[PDB]
Write a protein that binds this ligand. Structure first.
Ligand SMILES: Nc1nc2c(ncn2[C@@H]2O[C@H](COP(=O)(O)OP(=O)(O)NP(=O)(O)O)[C@@H](O)[C@H]2O)c(=O)[nH]1
Ligand SMILES: [Mg+2]
Length: 166
């Protein structure tokens, strides 16, 4: 079957794993559990297509920069995740977009900008600023909460559709 190699990237603690585990296993993980590199494979049906989601949940930490070029090369589509109550993680986003474009020799890599933790009241990144950054990249902006599941399927399925239309 058709396989979609998805990679989730972004600063430490923004919710990459909580998003991925919500999509694949339908629960919100509240605990502290830093990732090194996890892979998730799930057979699903998206818009009637039978397909394999091959998802790589990556580390936010700098100390594993050596793994990054390799997974960026293999990935077909990226979720670039920040948290809406962490301005630094938003400010960091362009670093991920820049390294992916360089390693993939492409200025149009399938990608979704994901503003996670939108269930939280104490927002410090306004949606408009994030929507403007996404527009500047020519990619969708989607807000998510791994806690309530708001936007989760949307973010991952939109990324699949970006790959289909690439
Ligand atoms: N309220 C809220 N908290 C969230 C949400 N997403 C993740 N969190 C919380 O934020 C923390 C870090 O989440 P986690 O998924 O481990 O982040 P990560 O980006 O995978 N971290 P790392 O880069 O270390 O692997 C956890 O306490 C998790 O419960 C969200 O949408 N809402
Ligand atoms: Mg993680």
């Amino acid at each position: 079957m058709t396989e979609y190699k998805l990679v989730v990237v972004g600063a430490g603690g923004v919710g990459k794993s909580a998003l991925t585990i919500q999509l694949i296993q339908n629960h919100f993980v509240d605990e502290y559990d830093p990732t090194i590199e996890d892979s998730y494979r799930k057979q699903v049906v998206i818009d009637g297509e039978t397909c394999l989601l091959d998802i790589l949940d990556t580390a936010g930490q700098e100390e594993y920069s050596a793994m990054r070029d390799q997974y960026m090369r293999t990935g077909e589509g990226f979720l670039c995740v920040f948290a809406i109550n962490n301005t630094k993680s938003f400010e960091d986003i362009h670093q991920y977009r820049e390294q992916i474009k360089r390693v993939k020799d492409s200025d149009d890599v399938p990608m979704v900008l994901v503003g996670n933790k939108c269930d939280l009241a104490a927002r410090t990144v306004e949606s408009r600023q994030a929507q403007d950054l996404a527009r500047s990249y020519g990619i969708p902006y989607i807000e998510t909460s791994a806690k309530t599941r708001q936007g989760v399927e949307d973010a991952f399925y939109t990324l699949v559709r970006e790959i289909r239309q690439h």
